Ligand binder design. Structure first.
Ligand SMILES: Nc1ncnc2c1ncn2[C@@H]1O[C@H](COP(=O)(O)OP(=O)(O)NP(=O)(O)O)[C@@H](O)[C@H]1O
Ligand SMILES: [Mg+2]
Length: 217
């Protein structure tokens, strides 16, 4: 409310370095922020999505300018700060959140897509997986494998995604975000259900990111 124009300036700087669905997504977030004008943003996932984009802006600011295809964003650092914010706000006693992120530099567009992705899925774990549970575990992993394949995992031991619900093909706004960003990353998403929990795995080709980013231009 005192940072409205500054927040908007940051989200615009992000917006003007990205494209396609991602750029659109940032555009929406910018508008919705101003409408509430604060705060205004905390009662739903808006605050969370703003924070993912601000944390990304901070990484860009530190990294300086470079070609859209240049690997300049430290993903592990960025995902760690997303995860920390989420467990701090949306966490709860008796719920353990482990975080294991590899050191890897990626392009801005790649980071933004993955960051929002992790925000969506991880929030989902803490918000939904433990409704009726007294204790739980969430694990976030980000592992570089062979052939520049990055695997991002979010694991619950909680309640499980309802069977009728075929997330992320079905769901609320979060599910639509996830499907778009996965597509923009050239990635593959998979989900595993049950009362033993929800396991989400996104396989991302970091080798193909340069190609994706330049095709958008
Ligand atoms: N880890 C999980 N464990 C249990 N249920 C889940 C989990 N993730 C998602 N769900 C369920 O799937 C639904 C769809 O989630 P989603 O598409 O992200 O929308 P949402 O989280 O409800 N609202 P939004 O803030 O926009 O994401 C949720 O409402 C939950 O009922
Ligand atoms: Mg959600």
């Amino acid at each position: 409310p005192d940072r409205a124009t500054e927040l908007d300036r940051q989200l615009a700087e992000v917006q003007h370095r990205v494209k396609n669905h991602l750029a659109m997504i940032v555009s929406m977030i910018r508008i919705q922020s101003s409408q509430a004008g604060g705060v205004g943003s905390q009662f739903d996932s808006l605050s969370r999505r703003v924070e993912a984009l601000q944390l990304l802006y901070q990484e860009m600011d530190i990294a300086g300018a470079a070609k859209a295809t240049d690997k300049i964003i430290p993903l592990g650092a960025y995902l760690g700060r997303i995860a920390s914010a989420i467990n701090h706000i949306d966490g709860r006693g008796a719920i353990k959140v482990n975080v294991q992120a590899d050191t890897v530099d990626v392009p801005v567009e790649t980071a933004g897509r993955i960051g929002l992705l992790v925000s969506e899925v991880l929030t989902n774990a803490l918000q939904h997986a433990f409704s009726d549970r007294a204790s739980g575990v969430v694990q976030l992993r980000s592992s570089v494998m062979s052939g520049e394949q990055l695997r991002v995992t979010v694991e619950d031991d909680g309640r499980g995604i309802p069977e009728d619900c075929d997330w992320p093909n079905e769901g609320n706004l979060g599910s639509r975000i996830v499907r778009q960003l996965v597509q923009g990353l050239g990635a593959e998403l998979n989900v595993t259900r049950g009362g033993t929990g929800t396991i989400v795995n996104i396989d991302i080709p970091l080798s193909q990111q340069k190609t994706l980013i330049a095709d958008e231009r």
